[PDB]
């Protein structure tokens, strides 16, 4: 399985197929990591071309957020 | 205004036909709510019909139609009520004769000398009917109809009109840049297409639908993509967004048709999220 | 605080109106007057929002019985269709004289008949007060008004001791019991619109037992099909203090029931009662004067009030205050009067619809606030012509299946 980790600490899954790779970039070979650590980071939706092709008028609101304190 | 296909007495003098009315096309819920309602097109209800008149010399029982001879000038029709006579427009006299016929086909002809003695009275409303035949538009050549509202800055009255045409009243060159909306709400209270023509307004204030309304009840922002977002009316929100300006008026019947997004306010934005959901 | 619950077995038994214990009058009746420079030949500023000249085309609300549960009403030649229902403050009364100036203003704002060269009832038989050419017209001149005297400031108990319960709280329990009785009685009179313009505020800390009032509301709203409309409660009253609004950090409940601090009753029963907030004559909410609870559902004007004078035979603008000062009335007690008129006209034009459907017709046709649903104003500002002509869906509001 292939995963992409952001600087914000969230992880996103990437499709193994040529389309998904060629479209994002990610042609280089990935580094190895242990599942017992990687699973501890919060997960977002997978980056599949089949589900990015959608339209919306408005998006759903996020339940249980946290306060931004200045 | 409402009309019934069974009332041959009214359809005929106006120039309508029972088949033509039955074959009329649909109307959208959106436009049905926008147009104001007028009185029904029905046979006038003359009161206390058939009894004897109070005044002397009445030419006939109450509710009969009277006319004066053509040799003395253009003919004036009239109706005999209980306490006097009231004038009738040409088009309504025809409806009263046709409906109140009961076999009779023509009015009583009376001379000016006998007419001049009868007192004049005004006891029934008759301004609903037009004064000449209806020029009904053939829908196949004009399949499009719109309600139009406009108000000029500094004026105290809005103008309300109806427009009909072969296509939506947009320039032929710009017909390609009409936006097609998604439509989650199936109640029929949301539009299919939106167009932002010349001199459009971004920041708007809701007002009543009648032409004499003067209130300004809430502030909204309308995006180029067609959705509308609410703005909390507070000094901090207005200044943070850059909306310290005066908003333009809009009616609720037209504005309610755009999809509504989340509210814009300083408290609503001070939140953190790990990742967003997708319902 | 958890939303209300009801046990219909607690209905109070029916019976003629009378207090729970003997009472006596303690104070003189309030004097009234006109503010300097008013000209009653001009229309009241609040009537411009309602557009009454166009709403009256379909009729004036003929044949509708409206119950006014308040401080009673004093007859006047501009109210030719008034009926005496009963009295709960004095054993010998019938609800047909108001010592506080409140009741005749509320009633006249709904049904006062327009001006004419001669009045239909020139006779003036009305009794004296008890001791210890014109542009004004009601919203629905055709209605029939029933008067019931539920409360007054001028009367008190003539054996003031109340035992193991504090004399302050002892009076609230007597009011809750006497309110349920008046609602049941008013329904059996056959009224179709019940208007309540005097309400109680209570601390959320140990709210008073309302089992009797809960069942009374259910019986009148469902089994008798009456429309119940109540005021959101004026913030100048003795115990009413302001409630908090929506909180973005907790989208769990959008009306915020867990942060309530003041309870307003019978307004509390949002499943059977329509609660009205207030706005000025221009459309801004009277943020400083109305309680912003979670039960609020609609709003209407509440300033530049005008009405028929008790104790006289003409119009008035203000009431005599504590000092020599002449004090002008305003607030939700009057906004609820406007909605009682609109509710009466609508269920004259659509006589086949039930109470729950008439309420949905008013809610869906109102101009909404920026948040869609708020607490200072419910779904928005009432709109008469819209309620009488648009094609509203018969089912309640429902969310879409999917947005993508």
UniProtKB/Swiss-Prot annotation, chain B:
GO cellular component labels: peptidoglycan-based cell wall; plasma membrane
Subcellular location: Cell inner membrane
Uppermost EC category: hydrolase
Domain of life where this protein originates: Bacteria
Keyword Membrane appears in the UniProt entry: yes
EC number: 3.6.-.-
Primary subcellular site in the record, as a coarse category: membrane
GO molecular function: ATP binding; hydrolase activity
Membrane topology, Periplasmic segments: 1-279
Statement: the UniProt record of this protein carries the keyword Disulfide bond: yes
Topology of this chain in the membrane: Single-pass membrane protein
Function: An ATPase (shown for residues 80-506). Part of the ESX-5 specialized secretion system, which is responsible for the secretion of EsxN and a number of PE_PGRS and PPE proteins, including PPE41.
Subunit-structure text: Part of the ESX-5 / type VII secretion system (T7SS), which is composed of cytosolic and membrane components. The ESX-5 membrane complex is composed of EccB5, EccC5, EccD5 and EccE5.
Family per record: Belongs to the EccB family.
Additional information: Part of the eccB5-eccC5 operon, which is essential for in vitro growth.
Name this protein carries in UniProt: ESX-5 secretion system ATPase EccB5
Curated annotation (Swiss-Prot), chain C:
Catalytic EC class: hydrolase
Keyword Zinc listed: no
Compartment(s) where it occurs, according to its Swiss-Prot or TrEMBL record: Cell membrane
Keywords: Cell membrane, Hydrolase, Membrane, Protease, Serine protease, Signal, Transmembrane, Transmembrane helix
Induction annotation: Constitutively expressed during growth in culture.
The protein's Enzyme Commission number: 3.4.21.-
Gene Ontology molecular function terms on file: serine-type endopeptidase activity
CDD domains assigned to the protein according to its UniProt record, in alphabetical order: Peptidases_S8_S53
Pfam families in the cross-refs: Peptidase_S8
Sequence ranges assigned to domain Peptidase S8 in this UniProt record: 44-388
Bilayer topology annotation: Single-pass membrane protein
Any Gene Ontology CC annotation: plasma membrane
SUPFAM superfamilies, per database record: Subtilisin-like
Biased composition (Low complexity): 124-132
Active site: 70, 102, 333
GO biological process terms on file: protein processing
Family of this protein: Belongs to the peptidase S8 family.
Record's protein name: Mycosin-5
Protein's organism: Mycobacterium tuberculosis (strain ATCC 25618 / H37Rv)
Gene name of the record: mycP5
């Amino acid at each position: 399985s292939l995963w992409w980790v952001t600087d914000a600490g969230a992880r996103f899954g990437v499709e193994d197929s040529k389309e998904a790779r060629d479209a994002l970039g990610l042609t280089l070979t990935p580094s190895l990591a242990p599942w017992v650590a990687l699973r501890l980071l919060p997960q977002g939706p997978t980056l599949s071309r089949a589900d990015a092709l959608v339209e919306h008028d408005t998006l759903p609101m996020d339940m249980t957020p946290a306060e931004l304190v200045v | 205004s409402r009309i019934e296909p069974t009332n041959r007495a009214v359809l005929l003098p106006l120039g309508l036909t029972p088949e033509q009315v039955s074959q009329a096309r649909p109307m959208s819920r959106a436009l049905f709510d926008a147009l104001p309602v007028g009185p029904e097109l029905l046979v006038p209800e003359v009161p206390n019909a058939g009894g004897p008149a109070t005044f002397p010399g009445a030419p006939g029982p109450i509710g009969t139609v009277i006319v004066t001879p053509q040799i003395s000038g253009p003919q004036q029709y009239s109706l005999v009520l209980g306490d006097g006579v009231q004038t009738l427009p040409p088009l309504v006299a025809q409806i009263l004769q046709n409906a109140g016929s009961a076999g009779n086909t023509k009015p009583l002809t009376v001379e000016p000398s006998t007419l001049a003695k009868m007192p004049v009275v005004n006891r029934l409303d008759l301004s609903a009917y037009p004064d000449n035949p209806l020029e009904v538009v053939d829908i196949r050549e004009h399949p499009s109809t719109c309600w139009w509202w406009e108000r000029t800055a500094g004026e105290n009255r809005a103008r309300v009109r109806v427009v009909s045409g072969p296509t939506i009243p947009v320039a032929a060159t710009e017909m390609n840049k009409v936006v097609s909306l998604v439509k989650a709400d199936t109640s029929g209270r949301q539009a299919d297409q939106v167009y932002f023509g010349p001199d459009h307004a971004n920041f708007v204030a809701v007002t009543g639908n009648n032409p004499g309304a003067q209130t300004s009840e809430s502030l909204w922002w309308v995006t180029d993509a067609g959705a509308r977002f609410g703005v909390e009316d507070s000094k901090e929100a207005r200044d943070a967004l850059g909306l310290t300006l005066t908003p333009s008026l809009a009616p609720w019947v037209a504005l309610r048709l755009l999809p509504q997004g989340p509210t814009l306010s300083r408290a609503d934005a001070l939140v953190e999220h790990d990742t967003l959901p997708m319902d | 605080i958890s939303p209300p619950t009801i046990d219909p077995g607690a209905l109070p038994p029916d019976g003629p109106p009378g207090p729970l214990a003997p009472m006596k009058q303690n104070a003189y009746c309030t004097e009234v007057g006109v503010l300097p420079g008013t000209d009653f030949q001009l229309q009241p500023k609040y009537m411009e929002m309602l557009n009454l000249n166009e709403a009256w085309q379909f009729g004036r609300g003929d044949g509708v019985k409206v119950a006014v549960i308040d401080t009673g009403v004093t007859p006047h030649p501009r109210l030719p269709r008034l009926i005496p229902g009963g009295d709960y403050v004095m054993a010998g009364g019938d609800g047909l004289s108001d010592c506080d100036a409140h009741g005749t203003l509320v009633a006249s704002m709904i049904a006062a008949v327009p001006a004419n060269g001669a009045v239909p009832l020139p006779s003036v038989p009305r009794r004296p007060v008890t001791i210890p050419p014109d542009a004004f017209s009601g919203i629905a001149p055709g209605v029939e008004i029933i008067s019931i005297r539920q409360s007054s400031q001028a009367f008190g108990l003539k054996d003031p001791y109340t035992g193991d319960e504090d004399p302050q709280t002892a009076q609230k329990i007597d009011n809750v019991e006497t309110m349920a009785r008046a609602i049941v009685h008013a329904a059996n009179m056959g009224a179709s619109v019940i208007n309540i313009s005097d309400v109680m505020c209570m601390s959320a800390r140990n709210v008073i037992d309302q089992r009797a009032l809960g069942a009374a509301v259910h019986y009148a709203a469902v089994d008798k099909d009456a429309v119940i409309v109540a005021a959101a409660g004026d913030g100048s009253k003795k115990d009413c203090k302001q409630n908090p609004i929506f909180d973005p950090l907790q989208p769990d409940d959008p009306r915020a029931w867990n942060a309530v601090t003041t309870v307003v009753t019978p307004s509390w029963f949002h499943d059977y009662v329509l609660t009205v907030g207030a706005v000025d004559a221009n459309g801004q909410p009277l943020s400083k004067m109305s309680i912003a609870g979670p039960w609020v559902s609609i709003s209407a004007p509440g300033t530049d009030v005008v009405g028929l004078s008790p104790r006289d035979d003409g119009l008035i603008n203000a009431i005599d205050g504590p000092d020599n000062s002449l004090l002008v009335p305003a607030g939700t007690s009057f906004s609820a009067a406007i909605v009682s008129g609109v509710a009466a006209l609508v269920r004259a034009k659509f006589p086949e619809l039930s109470a729950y459907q008439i309420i949905n017709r008013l809610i869906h046709t109102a101009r909404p606030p920026a948040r869609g649903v708020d607490n200072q104003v419910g779904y928005g500002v009432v709109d008469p012509v819209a309620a009488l002509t648009w094609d509203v869906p018969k089912g309640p509001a429902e969310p879409p299946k999917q947005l993508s």
